[PDB]
Every structure is written in structure tokens, then in C-alpha cells.
Amino acid sequence: QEKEAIERLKALGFPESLVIQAYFACEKNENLAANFLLSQNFDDE
DSSP: EEEEHHTTTTTTTTTHHHHHHHTTTSSOOOOHHHTTTTTTOOOOO
């Protein structure tokens, strides 16, 4: 139901591995995920 983002979040240029846990952590949210992906840079592994 949220897989439509798992490619749109990946297509931003990121790996699917962050995508999953950046969507689901942000409550499968488009806008909030493009904030966990693009604003939560400060993070290793």
C-alpha cells in the first residue's frame, strides 16, 4: 500500500534499505519521509 514510495524514495537517489525504515519510521508518509531521507542525513550505517 506504500510500495509506491519505496521506489520514489529510492529514485531520489537513496538505497531501498534506508527507504523502508525512513517511510515506516515516519509513518509511511510521503512528505515526512522526504524529510527523514533528505533532512535526517546525519546518520551512519
